[PDB]
Structure formats: structure tokens, C-alpha cells
Amino acid sequence: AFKPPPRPDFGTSGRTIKLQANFFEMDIPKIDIYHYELDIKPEKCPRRVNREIVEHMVQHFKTQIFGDRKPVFDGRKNLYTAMPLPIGRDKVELEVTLPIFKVSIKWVSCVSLQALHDALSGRLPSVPFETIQALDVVMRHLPSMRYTPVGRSFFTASEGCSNPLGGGREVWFGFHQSVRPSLWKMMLNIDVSATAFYKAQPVIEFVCEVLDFKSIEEQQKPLTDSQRVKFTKEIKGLKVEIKRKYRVCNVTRRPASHQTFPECTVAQYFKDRHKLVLRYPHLPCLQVGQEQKHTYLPLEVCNIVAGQRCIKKLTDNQTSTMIRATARSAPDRQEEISKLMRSADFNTDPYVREFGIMVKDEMTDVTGRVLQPPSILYGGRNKAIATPVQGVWDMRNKQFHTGIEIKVWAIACFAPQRQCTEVHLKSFTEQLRKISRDAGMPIQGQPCFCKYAQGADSVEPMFRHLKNTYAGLQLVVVILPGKTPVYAEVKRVGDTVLGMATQCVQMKNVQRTTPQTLSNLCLKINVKLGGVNNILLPQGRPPVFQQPVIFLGADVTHPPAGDGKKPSIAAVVGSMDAHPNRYCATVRVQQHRQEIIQDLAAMVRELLIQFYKSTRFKPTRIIFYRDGVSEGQFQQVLHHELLAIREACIKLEKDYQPGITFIVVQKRHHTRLFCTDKNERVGKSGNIPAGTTVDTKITHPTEFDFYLCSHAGIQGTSRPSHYHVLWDDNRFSSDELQILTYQLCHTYVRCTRSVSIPAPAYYAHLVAFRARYHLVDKEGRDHQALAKAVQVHQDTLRTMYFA
RNA sequence: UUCACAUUGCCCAAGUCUUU
RNA sequence: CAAUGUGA
Ligand SMILES: [Mg+2]
Ligand SMILES: [Mg+2]
Ligand SMILES: [Mg+2]
Helix, strand or coil, X not given: CCCXXXXXXXXXXXXXXXXXXXXXXXXXXXXXXXXXXXXXXXXXXXXXXXHHHHHXXXXXXXXXXXXXXXXXXXXXXXXXXXXXCCCCCXXXXXXXXXXXXXXXXXXXXXXXXXXXXXXXXXXXXXXXXXXHHHHHHHHHCCHHHHCEEECCEEEXXXXXXXXXXXXXXEEEEEEEEEEECCCCCEEEEEEEEEEEEECCCEHHHHHHHHHCCCCHHHCCCCCCHHHHHHHHHHHCCCEEECCCXXXXXXXXXXXXXXXXXXXXXXXHHHHHHHCCCCCCCCCEEEEECCCCCCEEEEHHHCEECCXXXXXXXXXXXXXXXXXXXXCCCHHHHHHXXXXXXXXXXXXXXXXXXXXXXXXXXXXXXXXXXXXCCXXXXXXXXXXXXXXXXXXXXXXXXXXXXXXXXXXXXXXXXXXXXCCCCHHHHHHHHHHHHHHHHHCCCCECCCXXXXXXXXXXXXXXXXXXXXXXHCCCCXXXXXXXXXXXXXXXXXXXXXXXXXXXXXXXXXXXXXXXXXXXXXXXXXXXXXXXXXXXXXXXXXXHCCHHHHCCEEEEEEEEECCCCCCCCCCEEEEEEEECCCCCCCEEEEEEEECCCCCCCCCHHHHHHHHHHHHHHHHCCCCCEEEEEEECCCHHHHHHHHHHHHHXXXXXXXXXXXXXXXXXXXXXXXXXXXXXXXXXXXXXXXXXXXXXXXXXXXXXXXXXXCECXXXXXXXXXXXXXXXXXXXXXXXXXXXXXXXXXXXXXXXXXXXXXXXXXXXXXCHHHHHHHHHHHHHHHHCCCCCCHHHHHHHHHHCCCCCCCCCCCCC
């Protein structure tokens, strides 16, 4: 229940493709290096201040201690040198003055780089984390002081240009950096990125950008409360400088001319003490420091401090500008990374040099294989087979494997009759019925009910009327004007209060229909009503299907940046047939920002019970695709969640012990793959083709992991999903697990495309997002209330309501 | 709220200090 | 999922 399995073999399936990865090979010396523990008092200092302290300390005490030695430092408590310091094992207390600190330096160990080499060649069974940590500190040392660290990235203002976003914000470009072991060598993983920062500009200019002034001379008088409040929202919490740096905690209500402190005015204080006559005395002051004290700075003497990341959500226009500034095709992204590596020149970093490290300036070459897609079987008379090409197929001249006959359905139009007229509704209905008949999901007649309504209050009484009036009602089609709170109310009432299938459609897609939008709509309707859109070609499936097996997908979704109290949402879905096509869902609220799925045992039990009810088989294997767990959480998550799956089995039946395969899926990581050969680039975005698989060179030196880019890249640079097998009772070969994973990406019911993660994992995201919708403005008695909100109706429990 | 892909928002990571 | 783009 602990150590991940070794890689069983390497995959052999599929034609080869030449790739380049944004991994840059490192040459690491084979010497010991030294680790010292540092303590700085006071210790409440920001990491960057600590780095400054240790910098001043090293230069100052070079005589006593650091002769020709260039230490690296993590900004907390860890210091490394390439040669021993003349300290012994003895602690030393050092006094360092910073333009006032006590610093103790105590040795703690020797880190062997030889051992890391041995572990990379699979001699040693495991990778020494602390050694990789040391190398990371070496590589981060100088950029952490030169640039602004954000996460594992570094950002700086661009030289020679500006990317304003408006509102006092601008784009900064930067790069991700991390050190990774691989089958080949140590690798430096580098990617480019961009994020929003506040412009270092005078606060007066900041005010102008936020209140949409061309100049401040526009604002004759004091600000309106409306303006002053808008300004306060934007600058509160930001750092400003006058030498002195300060955080802003408020904006005064009174202008500097009449704002007073004990008792004297602000404008008069600066006249007398600093011999300064304010322009703009009609403007308010920033309050800074302790909000309980009374330190006020006129706007005119303040600059926004450089290098503060913007944490607040961008406006829609700012987002537009950001996308426009940063979107790149895959070849353009590849060239940006390569260009950055040639300019970064890691090898003349004197700390990199001190530690004898070399970094290749060219991307690693790696060979991929492009897996063949499964064939897709449809139904009706013809039982048509679709063949995916470059990640896509379509349903033209095909009928659903099992299509639902729709006999009783209603329309509720919450869009205004003046815009979405009865003629629109009639036309939409005629076109929908045509497409549905072609798909083998015949809508046998007109709806039983078609009415206009307005506002969230009308939803529940209408739906109760419908449920009570129309026996055999299968579907309510709900037309919505655009973004509206009515949508969340429809899903509260449908999914959780009354247990009724609903399909919402925006008015614009009723007013003007296309065959492709209507066809996609039918994919969802058939699914919601219990149909089987299509199945993997049965004889083309891997051998795991010869015995009963259940596929689980699991995700936790965390609340947005800055949020302090909302729950995290855990979702787990399980397959319910042998195809595998149909799924049931479970969902829970749990502790804020907890990744481990707390109630997983109960959720899996529910799904196992429903699987047996649906198939009359007990799974001999459980294949668990777990989304979104980072490497630094693998052991904690595996420990709880593998045992929770076992617990669900044991409590169902004594000696019921199906084999478990536990696979982490990670869409968001920093590995990018590019075609080496221009003639392999697919489409306008120039990405690798769907089915591109990598399990050599850049993957783990001992464990069982692979990249699989299962989808067609439409825009930008494709994220190749990564799969790490943390447990495998079933002893899959690489080929069989890779092919299984790819085939499951072709079972997602909402589109005739291979998607970027397996259908079970994708459904878990949809379930979590629907629960978030059930919680809008609602997020022990507390836990109970949130838990009630996400519990679907008894009649919804067994459905694919989340599609 | 037709759908996918892509950017950001999500665990790990990162971040958080003292004269008006 | 939401904001924004690219597409079918
Ligand atoms: Mg997640
Ligand atoms: Mg943390
Ligand atoms: Mg969107």
C-alpha cells in the first residue's frame, strides 16, 4: 500500500515519431556537497529578505568563513556549498547588518551526488529526494534574487516593450524551471509563461488608469464616493514606496488638505516637516502600515512598488488582451523556449559554475509512438463503424448504439418572447427532430407543453406542474437568454429537488441552428435519457475486458484563488457496463483545499453496488484514474485512497479482493512535446498527432509512467497528459495500459473526438463542476448544509445528469 | 447554457516583516 | 465550470 511498482517493460505498439521535449540535459559532478542549517532571528522575514541577509553575510564574512566559496541558499534554513566551510561541525553565531540580524550556521550533512547517479542508473532502488532538492536550490539561487519568483517560475518586466492591460496592470513574461530525474540524465525542465503584474508607476498614474482618466486634471474636485470606493478596492493590500516601503490598508475619506492626524492636517504636515507643497490636495491619502494607527501618505509622494503579482481576477477586457499577448502555436512556443535557453545561459551562472553543473542548450530528442485509435461502433440497422483520423470522427450516416425514443417532452423558454419567438421555437424543434431521427433517437412528436416564463421564481412551480401533470415525461428542454441565475435554479430543481432530466440551450442556438450544434446537443440528450451513444469495437479492446472490470475516475476541485472558506469538492464516477460507456456519479463536499478524497470508501462502495445492480457481475479488477495529484502528494494520496478502495471491497464482502490499478492523471504539468520534423506538425497549431505516446528518455528512471497526448491539438500547444501508475495488482504491460488509456479517451459521450484525458476522469470534473453550480451563493451544521446541497434526487442518482 | 482544444483560476509549490 | 480566444 506504499511503494509504486517498477516499470514492467517498454511499450512497442504504434509507428515511431521523432519528438523534442522542453527538457534540457544536465551534467552533474560526482562529488559530495555540504548542507548547513541556518537560523535567522528574527524569523518572520519574507523569503526574499532572508536571501538578502545571507548575501550580505557571505560577502561580509568572506574573510573568516567564505574564501572563494559561493554558497547557495533556499531562503529559509538550507545552505549548500561545493567545498567544505572551515566551520567544522560547530555552530557559529554571526551578526549581520542589513541596509540587524543574528545568524547561526550549523552543519547538518553531506549530500552525495554520486548516489544520485547510481539511483538514475537504477542501481539504487530509489531517488534521493534531498539530493534533488539540493540541485534545485543551486539552480534557483540567482534567479530568485534577480527575478520575481512565483511558484516554480520566475518573472521579469520585458526589456524594450510594454504589455499594458489597463487598470494599472501589465503582462510580465517569465519561465518555469524545475530539476527532474529521468531514465537518461538529470533534466532541467524549462517552459515559458506569462502573468499579470502591477506596473511600477506613480500612484497618481495608477489612480488615472483605474478611474479611466486621461490625466488627473480631469478630476477637478474630490472623488465621488463611487470613484473613491472603486480606487480603494484596487489599491488596498498593495505595497507602495515613497527608501520606505508600505502596504496600503485603506484610503482616507477626506482629502489631504483636510485629513488630520494627532492634531494636524496631512497637507500641512508635509509643508512644515518636508517643505513640500502638494499639488492635488483635493485627493485622498493612502493609509498604510497598522490599520489601527494613523500613517497617511498623499498619493503624490507614492509609487506602486515594482514586482507585485496581480492576484485578483482580470476583467474580461484584460483577459482578452492577455490571451492576445500570449497565445502561440506549438512551433512558436518551441522557438520561444529554445530562444530563452540560449539567452538564459545557465552555464555562466556563477553558482551553477561553483557546483560544476553544465546544462545543454538544446531540447532533448525523444522518440514517441503514435498509437492506433480504436474503431467506434454505432447502432441502428447498419451498425456503422467509425474510424478516428487525427483524433476526430463524426456521426454522419450513423445511429446511436442504443438510442432513446422520446415520446413525452416539454419546452420551457425563459428567454423573452420578443427575441425568442414562437417561430424560432417551432423552427428549432423541427430541426432538432430531423437531426434526432437521423441519429436514431427519434423525437416522435411535438412537445406536450411549451410555455414562456421569466425569472428564477418560476422554475420550481413550473417543474412541479410538469412532473405532476405529464406521465412518462422524459425531458424538459430549457431555453435561456444567455448568462442567468435561472440556469443554476434549473439544475437545483431538476437534479436535486425533483429528479427530472433537463437540457438547457442558449437562445442564440435556438434562433440560429446548425447541424453540428444540434447533433452535439443530441449526444447529450441521448445520454441523459439513458442511451448508449456508441461503444468501443468489442473485439478491438485490450484483454482486461475478458473479465468484469470497473473503471473509476476521481477528481477534487478546489475553490478559486483568494478564497478562504469554500469547500473543496470530491467527485468519483464508475463505469456501469462492459462497453464501457455508461457511468454513475458520487460527489462530496470536503475540507477547504484538501486534495485527499476524505469519503472515498463510501463513494466506491456506492459505485460497486450500482455496478453489480447494473451488470450482475462483481468486478475482478478496479482501474482508478485519479486526476490532478502532484508528485509531492503521491504517497499521502495513495496511502489514504488505496486503502479506502480496499476498505470499500472488504466491507462489501469477506475475501472480496479485486486487483486495483491506481493511476494518477496529470494534465497540468510543464512538459511539452514538439514534432522534430515539420511534416509531422498537424494543422494550423502545428501540434503532435493524437495518440503520441512517450515512455522513454524523459520519464521516471524506475517507476511506471508515460505521456499520452490523446487529443487533436486545435490551438496553442497541446498539453500531453501524464499517467503515473502508483499501484498495480493487475500487472499490466506498458502496451496494454497505454492502449487501454487511449481507448478510454474515445468513450467520452459529449463529442465524436478523442479527448485529452480518459472519459472517467473527464466525467469526474463535470460532476464536481455541477456540484459547484448546486452550491452557488450557498458556500458540522455547516457541513451538513453544504452536503445536502450537492446530494442529487433519488431518481437522479443512477443517471448521467452531469453530461 | 452544443462541443472540444488552448490561457488563467485548483493539491504540492509559491506567497506573508518594521514617523504620520 | 467561469472569463477569453481558436475551431467543428
Ligand atoms: Mg482536481
Ligand atoms: Mg504549502
Ligand atoms: Mg469557454
